[PDB]
Design a protein around this nucleic acid. Structure first.
Lengths: 183, 814, 183
DNA sequence: GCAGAAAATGAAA
DNA sequence: TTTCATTTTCTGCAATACTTTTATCAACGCAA
RNA sequence: UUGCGUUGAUAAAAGUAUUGUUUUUGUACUCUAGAAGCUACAAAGAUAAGGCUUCAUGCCGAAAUCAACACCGGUGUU
């Protein structure tokens, strides 16, 4: 992947997506902004091409999964060609369309291996956020110690007051109904 | 030849060996463990049984949704409004027509609140609630309370002019059954889609509770707490398995007291306590064939048959200072009065099975199922089952007695022997060689603990005895065999140790009557304890005190102002800062209304003089005050359980720690410390194993200030011993770990002493470490320079073993 | 993935692996070193934590595929624990072991879709290097009219002068024979 | 009994 | 002299009303 | 030591009821049909973080077990 202003818009969009308050994401151990520099970064003052490699890569690594980083690379390759997409919509909407259709291919081909779960995210205060996202994975691509090689995250935007059920059957039934609610 | 002196206490043992020749003290220590008591198991069982109630309520509304979809009444459970009145709808459906949605709302509200079903001051108020139920439903009662007193739920004491009477919201569930039946019957008169199978299925969802001897589970669920088992066996009654064993055959079940053989055995063992064989047979036939007798007619009959006056009669039982007593049959005679089934001619063993089925089960369903599943090719009649359940419910003080300590096998071996010989049961048992009452388990060198812990007095004495048995095993491992063992229920462990040394032909006399005092503790390493406190808090964003930006504060609430404790709380918050109340920042007119009885007079006196303190309005119609919120403190360490459509953060607080991982890096030369809590682990998402994943562990390693080029030294649990050493003055001290405290401050550790349970504050540690705090808690910073940290593993006798590196990677999979 | 001195060691090792002369590497359109700054970089003067994000990511993106970048992140996670590994072996050897055992799992589990081909790498003069590596991919996980999502590269260290044969049976037989020759 | 911010203290800037 | 960085201290924590079974200890008597 | 009667203390396990805390929504109270979200009341959701398969009188999660490491119930080491 290569780094430009679209990565800044994508980072800000997913930061607003997963975190309730802004101060959590910008004081994490590895990003470590101040308040004035964060206000300069959000307003387009500082350019994300000549920042530190470690800080930008930590910002990218906290928000995305590693298969999702491979999908960022492939998305950018497919998106900087075929300039009707560059005429039409911004990069994060195209990134969501790409990973959603990857999930549709996963659900179509091999429906026996798709497992899911709740996702807990650590903030900058020492605390975690229980039920921060919905994680989906393939059981057959399973490294030892509970890590998985192929994995994606989603954020559900449903309006009713009822959570996602546990169990394999019930959760995989829930994902197929509310496909256009998960983002 | 040595001597082991062992002191057993409530929460500690302490031992020492002596030489018996010279007389020097060779070895001494103390083992410390928590005293095992059952206020933790009470909390565990209470929470286990309450989670099932919340589970089953949620499953009731799930089943009602599946019923309304499976019969085609409504299709999407998204458009249903949550702001209609259910009680007005229950009365309106009691008399007029409802559509599908209002019917679903009323029946859902009834399934959420069904009644009690077992039928001091509480029983009086429940009887008063049932008093208004002969012409009214619960719906009319609750609607009358709602329209009159403006308040329905809870339990409250609305003041009537004549007297103050406390209302409550519990009704019997038969009233709910009648209300739902009338509602569904009038709707059946209007709606054609409501069928009668729908009515019976709803009434089985509404009034369906499991029996107390059925337990949890299903035919396909296979739990190990109720009927259906994990061994593939279905038990008719769960308590049946719990019956004890015979006293001489440990594989046969204990016999029921209301059988034929037990009553014969008891009458014959009482008659031989006082006769020929024919006289005993005649007495048995007399008490077996005549009706309405007691001890007096029987003693007159023994006096008449023996031709002797009732005196010089040697031994009979007596209850108290008055009359005597003797075994009659008394259940065979009360079973003889049964009209439908004939009982004079059945068998011996069918009487035993019938007494077993009547002794175990009290409900009619358990009696019915046991009669169908224990009398194969018995082919009973239905009226026999109804008379049997009526007879069981009739006199339950006679069938609900218990279980006679022998079994039917031993009582069939012993009953034809005490016809001829005039001796008792014990002498026949010693004659027959039936003396086998053992719990044998074989080792070859040491003592078994499950052997000795076969008798349950208390958990604390069992805990102390098995700790002492481990002490003795490791002590005679280390210092050879012994000669004398002096220890401190007592005759039980005494007899067990004498039997152990006499079986293994070791002649040893066991009897029940400084700086180098080593210690050894019990390391606590269980990993699923209670994760946090149980009150759910709510947070707001504000600026309180010397603050310049908006920050997240945790709210606190005064539940009742009128009570004395509410006045103490209000006075402390009033004298600290008045602007910490939320009413002072959203409505100051009501707050000067609050300052007025403070200044003139406290709230209890105003409540006696005028009633509840009202909210200020332009008229006298505003609401009243009973509680007040305030800003407690800032937000620190928490678990964020904020709901999906909230807007303020909702948290759980005061989360408990589990273990620490000590690291070291060769760049700056200082030690670094992780902290894991009980809430950091997780049931994993695919298989359900309880472990901590590796990416989350690297997140905790990033957060707790540990560089990734650091070698992993060791792991520390609670009560695990620890050695801290200085590196320029070379003074050392060893401590007990407790926790990793204050998650804002890096590398802070709370330590407990090695010589006592509490520091009590003030004394002096190593010069680098500092002085223990004045209040009593020692929490120091170990992530300094010029220090060294080792682990101390001590065996059960208390010999130190100092370790520097105990593995290659932290243990995260169990 | 996160960026430290081990990534510098990995970049220098793979650059020595794929290019015949060093000058081709740095003069590419997106890295763009001079000679003195390249000599400063190779001797460890400049640290790859505070360099530009675009330059470091272009150096990593030219050498690796995006699935290989995800595998770098996963191998870093498994490698910074278990302190026998950190002391005993330099990173790139453990990364090679990781990608080889991933290849063994690919050949064992799903033997029906592993296809291959030769790999051409562009230098800084406008020219490419024909037959620079051997690329392997999974046929079922290929973006429509696009390059394969799951993809790896290898460089054979065999001593005979015979290239890799064409056809799909013969190449897949060839990979199974020369497993201890590819690095 | 103990988690852990609040209030107090100390060493730069 | 404001301000960030380490050491002490002192305040606060979930409840109540029914129903039932099995087992083990005691002590108070009849017997060997 | 064994058995039978009374009555105390304890332990293990099971079935239910009403609250309490908190979130959204509605009605009232306040300020100008809007706002503010205090103070009452009533619905609906959650109630240790979470997880499973068998699709339901569904199930599990707050207790106990304890010095580690190496070699055929024993034996050896830092």
């Amino acid at each position: 992947m290569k780094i430009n202003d679209d990565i800044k818009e994508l980072i800000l969009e997913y930061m607003s997506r997963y975190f309730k308050f802004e101060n959590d994401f910008y004081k994490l151990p590895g990003i470590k902004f101040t308040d004035a520099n964060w206000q300069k970064f959000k307003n387009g003052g500082t350019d994300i091409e000549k920042m530190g490699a470690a800080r930008v890569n930590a910002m990218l690594d906290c928000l995305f999964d590693d298969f999702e980083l491979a999908m960022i690379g492939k998305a950018q390759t497919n998106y900087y060609n075929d300039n009707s997409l560059k005429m039409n919509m911004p990069f994060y909407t195209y990134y969501d369309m790409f990973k959603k259709q990857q999930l549709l291919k996963w659900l179509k081909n091999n429906r026996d291996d798709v497992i899911g779960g709740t996702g807990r995210m650590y903030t900058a205060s020492g605390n975690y956020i229980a039920n921060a996202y919905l994680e989906v994975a393939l059981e057959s691509s399973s490294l030892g110690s509970g890590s998985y090689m192929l994995q994606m995250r989603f954020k559900d935007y449903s309006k009713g007051q009822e959570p996602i059920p546990s169990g394999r059957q019930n959760r995989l039934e829930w994902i197929e109904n509310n496909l256009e609610n998960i983002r | 030849d040595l001597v082991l002196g062992l002191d057993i206490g409530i929460g500690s043992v302490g031992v020492g060996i002596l030489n018996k020749v010279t007389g020097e003290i060779i070895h001494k220590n103390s083992r410390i463990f928590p005293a095992a008591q059952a206020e933790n198991n009470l909390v565990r069982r209470t929470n286990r049984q309450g989670r099932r109630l919340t589970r089953r309520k949620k499953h009731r509304r799930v089943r009602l949704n599946r019923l309304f979809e499976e019969s085609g009444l409504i299709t999407d459970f998204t458009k249903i409004s949550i702001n209609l009145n259910p009680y007005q709808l229950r009365v309106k459906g009691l008399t007029d027509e409802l559509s599908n949605e209002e019917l679903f709302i009323a029946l859902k509200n009834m399934v959420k609140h069904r009644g009690i079903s077992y039928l001091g001051d509480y029983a009086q108020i429940v009887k008063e609630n049932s008093k208004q139920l002969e012409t009214k439903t619960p719906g009319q009662i609750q609607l009358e309370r709602y329209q009159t007193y403006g308040q329905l739920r809870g339990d409250f004491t609305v003041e009537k002019d004549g007297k103050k009477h406390r209302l409550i919201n519990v009704f019997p569930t038969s009233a709910y059954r009648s209300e739902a039946l009338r509602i569904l019957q009038t709707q059946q008169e209007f709606n054609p889609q409501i069928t009668d199978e729908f009515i019976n299925r709803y009434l089985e969802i509404l009034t369906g509770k499991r029996k107390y001897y059925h337990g949890p589970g299903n035919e396909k669920s296979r739990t190990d707490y109720g009927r259906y088992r994990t061994s593939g066996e279905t038990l008719d009654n769960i308590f049946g398995i719990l019956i004890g064993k015979c006293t001489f055959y440990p594989d046969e079940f204990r016999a029921a007291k209301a059988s034929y053989t037990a009553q014969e055995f008891n009458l014959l063992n009482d008659l031989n306590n006082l006769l020929s064989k024919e006289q005993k047979n005649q007495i048995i036939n007399y008490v077996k064939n005549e009706k309405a007798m007691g001890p007096a007619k029987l003693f007159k009959y023994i006096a008449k048959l023996l031709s002797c006056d009732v005196a010089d009669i040697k031994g009979y039982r007596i209850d108290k200072s008055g009359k005597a007593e003797i075994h009659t049959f008394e259940a065979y005679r009360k079973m003889k009065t049964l009209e439908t089934l004939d009982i004079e001619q059945m068998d011996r063993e069918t009487l035993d099975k019938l007494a077993y089925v009547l002794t175990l089960n009290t409900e009619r369903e358990g009696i019915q199922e046991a009669l169908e599943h224990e009398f194969a090719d018995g082919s009973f009649s239905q009226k026999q089952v109804d008379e049997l359940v009526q007879f069981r419910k009739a006199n339950s003080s006679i069938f609900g007695k218990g279980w006679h300590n022998f079994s039917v096998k031993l009582m069939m071996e012993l009953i034809p022997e005490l016809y001829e010989t005039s001796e008792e049961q014990m002498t026949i048992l010693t004659r027959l060689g039936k003396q086998k009452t053992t719990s044998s388990s074989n080792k070859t060198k040491y003592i078994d603990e499950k052997l000795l812990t076969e008798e349950i007095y208390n958990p604390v004495v069992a805990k102390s005895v098995r700790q002492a048995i481990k002490i003795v095993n490791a002590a005679i491992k280390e210092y050879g065999d012994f000669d004398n063992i002096v220890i401190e229920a007592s005759r039980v462990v005494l007899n067990a140790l004498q039997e152990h040394f006499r079986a293994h032909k070791i002649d040893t006399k066991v009897s029940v009557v400084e700086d180098s005092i080593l210690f050894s503790y019990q390391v606590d390493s269980k990993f699923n304890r209670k994760i946090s406190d149980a009150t759910i808090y709510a947070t707001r964003q504000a600026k309180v005190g010397k603050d310049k930006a908006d920050e997240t504060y945790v709210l606190g609430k005064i539940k009742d102002i009128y009570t004395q404790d509410g006045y103490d709380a209000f006075m402390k918050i009033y004298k600290k800062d008045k602007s910490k109340f939320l009413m002072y920042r959203h409505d100051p007119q009501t707050f000067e209304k609050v300052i007025e009885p403070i200044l003139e007079n406290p709230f209890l006196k105003y409540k006696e003089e005028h009633g509840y303190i009202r909210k200020y309005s332009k008229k006298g119609n505003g609401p009243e005050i009973k509680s007040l919120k305030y800003y407690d403190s800032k937000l620190g360490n928490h678990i964020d359980i904020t709901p999906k459509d909230s807007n303020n953060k909702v948290v759980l607080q005061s989360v408990s720690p589990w273990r620490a991982d000590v690291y070291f890096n060769k760049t700056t030369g200082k030690y670094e410390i992780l902290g894991l809590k009980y809430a950091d682990l997780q049931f994993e998402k695919g298989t359900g194993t309880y472990k901590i994943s590796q990416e989350k562990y690297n997140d905790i390693k990033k957060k707790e200030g540990v560089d990734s080029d650091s070698e992993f030294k060791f792991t520390l649990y609670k009560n695990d011993l620890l050695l801290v050493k200085d590196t320029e003055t070379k003074e050392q001290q060893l401590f007990r770990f407790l926790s990793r405290t204050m998650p804002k401050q890096k590398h802070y550790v709370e330590l407990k002493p090695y010589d006592k349970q509490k520091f009590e504050g003030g004394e002096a540690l190593i010069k680098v470490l500092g002085n223990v705090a004045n209040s009593g808690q020692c929490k120091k910073g170990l992530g300094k320079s010029n220090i060294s940290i080792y682990k101390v593993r001590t065996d059960v006798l208390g010999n130190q073993h100092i370790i520097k590196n105990e593995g290659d990677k932290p243990k995260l999979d169990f």
